[PDB]
Amino acid sequence: TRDQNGTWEMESNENFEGYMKALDIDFATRKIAVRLTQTKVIDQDGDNFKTKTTSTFRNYDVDFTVGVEFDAYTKSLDNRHVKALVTWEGDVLVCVQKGEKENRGWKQWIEGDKLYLELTCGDQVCRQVFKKK
Amino acid sequence: TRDQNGTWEMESNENFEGYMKALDIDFATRKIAVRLTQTKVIDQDGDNFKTKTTSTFRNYDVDFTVGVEFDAYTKSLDNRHVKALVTWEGDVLVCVQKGEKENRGWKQWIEGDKLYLELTCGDQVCRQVFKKK
C-alpha cells in the first residue's frame, strides 16, 4: 500500500547517533536526541503529504508519601541526590529538597482547573502553570 | 482541596532558564530544554502520590507533493538547506535531499501495522520503525 495515513508511534530507532554524527550535530543535542521517542502524524491525499513530527521523552516517575522523607535523584534535571520531604501547608504541597544546593524546593497547588508548581533554587524561582485536561 | 488528581498540561513555564542555570545545567542544554512543554499525570491516594511527567518537543511540520521539488531547512536536525524531491519507487516513498552532504535522503514505506523510515547521510543509515497509535 501507498497509504501512509495515520498517527505513528516510534518503536525502534537504530543508529540515530551515527546519522546525527554524519550531520555534524553537536554532542549536547545528540545526547538528548538519542533518548527521544517520536510520534509522526501523516495526512496524505494521493500525492499530497502533510506530516507533523513530535519528539517526546519520559521523565522518571516521582512517587512519594507526604510526611516521609525520601532519597531522590533529579535525573530529569541536574542529576543530583537530594533528601526530599513533602508536607502539606493547607492544601499546598510543600517540598524541601535537602542537598548540595542551598534553598532548593518546590510547592504545588490547585486553583480552579489549574495546577501551579513553583520550583526554587537559590535566588531563582520557576513558576509553572498547568491546565486540567 | 488536597486533591491533585488528574492529567495536567503545561500552559506556561516562567523563568525555566534561570532556574536551570541555578541548577548548573549547561547553556546548550538549557537552549534545547526551554523548547519543551510538559504533561503531568498525578495519581493520588490520600497522602500517597505517584507522578508521571512527560516532556515534549514540537518539531518540524513538513508538507510536500510527490514529484514537486521544494527547498527546506532541516531545522529539527542540522539546520542545513536542502533541495528535496520525493518520488515513488513501488510502494516506497523516496526523498533525495540535494545539498552539502553527499548521499543524503530518506525512504519511507508501510509493511502491515508498521511504518519504516530509513534516513541516510554519507555512509550512515538510520532505520526507524513506527507502529499505529
Side-chain angles (χ1 to χ4, degrees), chain A residues 10-16 19 36 38 40 53, chain B residues 77 107-109 114-119 125-130:
Chain A
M10 171 175 280
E11 87 166 13
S12 183
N13 190 5
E14 301 170 88
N15 195 34
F16 201 27
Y19 177 74
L36 304 184
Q38 295 183 8
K40 190 183 296 283
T53 303
Chain B
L77 289 165
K107 301 176 163 217
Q108 190 166 275
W109 73 93
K114 296 175 173 191
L115 178 155
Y116 294 83
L117 172 60
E118 280 202 348
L119 308 160
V125 179
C126 166
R127 178 137 162 165
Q128 303 178 342
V129 185
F130 302 71

Short mmCIF file of all heavy atoms in Angstrom, two decimals, chain A residues 10-16 19 36 38 40 53, chain B residues 77 107-109 114-119 125-130:
data_model
loop_
_atom_site.label_atom_id
_atom_site.label_comp_id
_atom_site.label_asym_id
_atom_site.label_seq_id
_atom_site.Cartn_x
_atom_site.Cartn_y
_atom_site.Cartn_z
N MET A 10 6.91 5.78 17.32
CA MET A 10 8.20 5.14 17.14
C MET A 10 8.38 3.96 18.08
O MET A 10 8.13 4.09 19.29
CB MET A 10 9.33 6.15 17.35
CG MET A 10 10.72 5.55 17.40
SD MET A 10 11.96 6.86 17.51
CE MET A 10 12.03 7.35 15.80
N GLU A 11 8.79 2.81 17.54
CA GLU A 11 9.09 1.65 18.38
C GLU A 11 10.56 1.25 18.30
O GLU A 11 11.06 0.52 19.15
CB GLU A 11 8.21 0.45 17.99
CG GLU A 11 8.76 -0.41 16.86
CD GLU A 11 8.05 -1.75 16.73
OE1 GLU A 11 6.97 -1.92 17.34
OE2 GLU A 11 8.56 -2.64 16.02
N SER A 12 11.25 1.71 17.26
CA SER A 12 12.66 1.35 17.06
C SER A 12 13.40 2.47 16.36
O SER A 12 12.87 3.10 15.44
CB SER A 12 12.78 0.05 16.25
OG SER A 12 14.14 -0.34 16.10
N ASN A 13 14.64 2.70 16.77
CA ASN A 13 15.45 3.75 16.20
C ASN A 13 16.91 3.29 16.21
O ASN A 13 17.57 3.40 17.23
CB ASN A 13 15.26 5.04 17.00
CG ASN A 13 15.88 6.26 16.34
OD1 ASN A 13 16.39 6.19 15.22
ND2 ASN A 13 15.81 7.38 17.03
N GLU A 14 17.38 2.74 15.09
CA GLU A 14 18.73 2.20 15.03
C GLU A 14 19.72 3.14 14.36
O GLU A 14 19.47 3.62 13.26
CB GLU A 14 18.75 0.87 14.29
CG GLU A 14 17.87 -0.21 14.88
CD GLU A 14 17.77 -1.40 13.96
OE1 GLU A 14 18.62 -2.30 14.06
OE2 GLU A 14 16.84 -1.43 13.11
N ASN A 15 20.85 3.37 15.03
CA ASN A 15 21.94 4.21 14.53
C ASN A 15 21.54 5.67 14.29
O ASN A 15 22.05 6.32 13.38
CB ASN A 15 22.55 3.61 13.25
CG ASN A 15 23.90 4.22 12.90
OD1 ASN A 15 24.69 4.56 13.78
ND2 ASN A 15 24.18 4.36 11.60
N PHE A 16 20.65 6.20 15.12
CA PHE A 16 20.36 7.63 15.08
C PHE A 16 21.62 8.43 15.37
O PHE A 16 21.85 9.48 14.79
CB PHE A 16 19.29 8.01 16.09
CG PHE A 16 18.58 9.31 15.78
CD1 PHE A 16 18.46 9.78 14.49
CD2 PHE A 16 18.02 10.05 16.81
CE1 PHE A 16 17.78 10.96 14.22
CE2 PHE A 16 17.35 11.24 16.55
CZ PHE A 16 17.23 11.70 15.26
N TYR A 19 23.95 8.61 12.28
CA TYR A 19 23.30 9.53 11.36
C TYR A 19 23.50 10.99 11.79
O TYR A 19 23.90 11.83 10.98
CB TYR A 19 21.81 9.18 11.26
CG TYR A 19 21.01 10.11 10.39
CD1 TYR A 19 21.12 10.09 9.00
CD2 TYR A 19 20.13 11.01 10.97
CE1 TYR A 19 20.36 10.95 8.22
CE2 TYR A 19 19.37 11.86 10.20
CZ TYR A 19 19.49 11.83 8.83
OH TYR A 19 18.72 12.69 8.07
N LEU A 36 15.04 10.30 22.81
CA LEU A 36 13.69 10.73 22.45
C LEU A 36 12.93 9.66 21.69
O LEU A 36 13.52 8.87 20.94
CB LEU A 36 13.76 12.01 21.60
CG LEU A 36 14.49 13.23 22.19
CD1 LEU A 36 14.37 14.43 21.26
CD2 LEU A 36 13.95 13.57 23.56
N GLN A 38 9.60 9.37 19.00
CA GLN A 38 8.88 10.24 18.10
C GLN A 38 7.46 9.77 17.81
O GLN A 38 7.18 8.57 17.80
CB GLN A 38 9.63 10.38 16.77
CG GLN A 38 10.99 11.06 16.87
CD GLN A 38 11.63 11.23 15.52
OE1 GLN A 38 11.00 10.97 14.49
NE2 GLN A 38 12.89 11.65 15.50
N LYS A 40 4.70 10.54 14.70
CA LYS A 40 4.61 11.14 13.39
C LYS A 40 3.17 11.05 12.93
O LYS A 40 2.62 9.96 12.84
CB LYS A 40 5.54 10.41 12.41
CG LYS A 40 5.70 11.09 11.07
CD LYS A 40 6.59 10.25 10.15
CE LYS A 40 8.00 10.14 10.70
NZ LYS A 40 8.79 11.38 10.45
N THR A 53 5.72 15.94 13.02
CA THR A 53 6.57 15.07 13.82
C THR A 53 6.89 15.68 15.18
O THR A 53 7.31 16.84 15.27
CB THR A 53 7.89 14.73 13.11
OG1 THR A 53 7.60 14.12 11.84
CG2 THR A 53 8.71 13.76 13.95
N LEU B 77 17.18 19.08 12.82
CA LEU B 77 18.44 18.35 12.84
C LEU B 77 19.62 19.32 12.76
O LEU B 77 19.97 19.94 13.76
CB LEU B 77 18.47 17.34 11.69
CG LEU B 77 17.55 16.13 11.83
CD1 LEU B 77 17.39 15.41 10.50
CD2 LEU B 77 18.11 15.17 12.88
N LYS B 107 13.88 7.19 2.92
CA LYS B 107 12.91 6.30 2.28
C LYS B 107 11.88 5.89 3.32
O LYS B 107 12.23 5.58 4.44
CB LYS B 107 13.59 5.05 1.71
CG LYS B 107 14.67 5.32 0.66
CD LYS B 107 15.33 4.01 0.26
CE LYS B 107 16.10 4.13 -1.05
NZ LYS B 107 15.98 2.88 -1.87
N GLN B 108 10.60 5.89 2.93
CA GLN B 108 9.52 5.62 3.87
C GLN B 108 8.49 4.69 3.24
O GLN B 108 8.06 4.94 2.11
CB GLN B 108 8.87 6.93 4.30
CG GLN B 108 7.90 6.80 5.43
CD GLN B 108 7.55 8.15 6.01
OE1 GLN B 108 8.27 8.67 6.86
NE2 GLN B 108 6.46 8.75 5.52
N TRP B 109 8.11 3.65 3.95
CA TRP B 109 7.13 2.71 3.42
C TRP B 109 6.36 1.96 4.51
O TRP B 109 6.78 1.90 5.67
CB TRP B 109 7.82 1.71 2.48
CG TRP B 109 8.68 0.69 3.18
CD1 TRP B 109 8.30 -0.56 3.59
CD2 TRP B 109 10.06 0.82 3.54
NE1 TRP B 109 9.36 -1.21 4.19
CE2 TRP B 109 10.45 -0.38 4.16
CE3 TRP B 109 11.00 1.84 3.39
CZ2 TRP B 109 11.74 -0.59 4.64
CZ3 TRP B 109 12.29 1.63 3.87
CH2 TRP B 109 12.64 0.43 4.48
N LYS B 114 3.08 -1.45 10.33
CA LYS B 114 4.26 -0.64 10.62
C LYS B 114 4.72 0.27 9.50
O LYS B 114 4.63 -0.05 8.32
CB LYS B 114 5.41 -1.55 11.04
CG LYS B 114 5.11 -2.30 12.34
CD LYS B 114 6.18 -3.31 12.70
CE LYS B 114 5.91 -3.89 14.08
NZ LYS B 114 7.07 -4.67 14.60
N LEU B 115 5.21 1.43 9.92
CA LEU B 115 5.84 2.38 9.03
C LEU B 115 7.35 2.30 9.21
O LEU B 115 7.84 2.40 10.33
CB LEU B 115 5.32 3.80 9.31
CG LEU B 115 5.88 4.97 8.51
CD1 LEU B 115 4.88 6.10 8.46
CD2 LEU B 115 7.16 5.50 9.13
N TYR B 116 8.06 2.12 8.10
CA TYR B 116 9.53 2.14 8.10
C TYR B 116 10.07 3.43 7.52
O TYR B 116 9.57 3.92 6.51
CB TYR B 116 10.09 0.95 7.31
CG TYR B 116 9.78 -0.36 7.97
CD1 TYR B 116 8.55 -0.97 7.78
CD2 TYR B 116 10.70 -0.97 8.80
CE1 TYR B 116 8.25 -2.15 8.40
CE2 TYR B 116 10.42 -2.16 9.41
CZ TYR B 116 9.19 -2.75 9.21
OH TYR B 116 8.89 -3.94 9.82
N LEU B 117 11.08 3.99 8.18
CA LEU B 117 11.74 5.20 7.70
C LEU B 117 13.25 4.99 7.80
O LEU B 117 13.77 4.79 8.89
CB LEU B 117 11.29 6.44 8.51
CG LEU B 117 12.05 7.75 8.23
CD1 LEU B 117 11.94 8.19 6.76
CD2 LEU B 117 11.59 8.88 9.17
N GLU B 118 13.92 5.01 6.66
CA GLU B 118 15.38 4.87 6.65
C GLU B 118 15.99 6.20 6.25
O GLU B 118 15.69 6.71 5.17
CB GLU B 118 15.84 3.77 5.69
CG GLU B 118 15.70 2.37 6.25
CD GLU B 118 16.61 1.36 5.56
OE1 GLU B 118 17.17 1.69 4.48
OE2 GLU B 118 16.76 0.25 6.10
N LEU B 119 16.83 6.75 7.12
CA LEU B 119 17.50 8.03 6.88
C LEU B 119 18.95 7.78 6.52
O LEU B 119 19.61 6.98 7.18
CB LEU B 119 17.43 8.92 8.13
CG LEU B 119 16.03 9.12 8.73
CD1 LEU B 119 16.12 9.56 10.17
CD2 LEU B 119 15.30 10.15 7.92
N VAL B 125 23.39 4.96 7.84
CA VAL B 125 21.97 4.71 7.65
C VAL B 125 21.30 4.52 9.01
O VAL B 125 21.75 3.73 9.84
CB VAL B 125 21.73 3.46 6.78
CG1 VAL B 125 20.23 3.20 6.61
CG2 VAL B 125 22.41 3.61 5.43
N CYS B 126 20.22 5.28 9.23
CA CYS B 126 19.41 5.15 10.43
C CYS B 126 18.09 4.52 10.03
O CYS B 126 17.43 4.98 9.09
CB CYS B 126 19.21 6.52 11.09
SG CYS B 126 17.91 6.59 12.37
N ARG B 127 17.70 3.47 10.74
CA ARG B 127 16.42 2.81 10.48
C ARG B 127 15.47 3.04 11.64
O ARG B 127 15.78 2.73 12.79
CB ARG B 127 16.61 1.31 10.25
CG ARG B 127 15.32 0.53 10.01
CD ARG B 127 15.54 -0.47 8.87
NE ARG B 127 14.55 -1.54 8.83
CZ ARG B 127 14.36 -2.35 7.79
NH1 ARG B 127 15.09 -2.19 6.69
NH2 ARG B 127 13.44 -3.30 7.84
N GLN B 128 14.32 3.61 11.32
CA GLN B 128 13.28 3.83 12.32
C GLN B 128 12.04 3.03 11.96
O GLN B 128 11.71 2.88 10.78
CB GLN B 128 12.96 5.32 12.44
CG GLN B 128 14.20 6.15 12.76
CD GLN B 128 13.95 7.64 12.84
OE1 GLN B 128 12.94 8.16 12.35
NE2 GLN B 128 14.88 8.35 13.47
N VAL B 129 11.38 2.49 12.97
CA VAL B 129 10.15 1.75 12.75
C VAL B 129 9.08 2.32 13.65
O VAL B 129 9.32 2.57 14.84
CB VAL B 129 10.30 0.23 13.02
CG1 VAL B 129 9.01 -0.50 12.64
CG2 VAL B 129 11.49 -0.37 12.26
N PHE B 130 7.89 2.55 13.08
CA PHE B 130 6.77 3.11 13.82
C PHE B 130 5.58 2.16 13.76
O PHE B 130 5.44 1.41 12.80
CB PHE B 130 6.33 4.48 13.26
CG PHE B 130 7.40 5.54 13.24
CD1 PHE B 130 8.47 5.47 12.35
CD2 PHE B 130 7.28 6.65 14.05
CE1 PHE B 130 9.44 6.47 12.33
CE2 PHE B 130 8.25 7.66 14.03
CZ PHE B 130 9.33 7.57 13.17
#
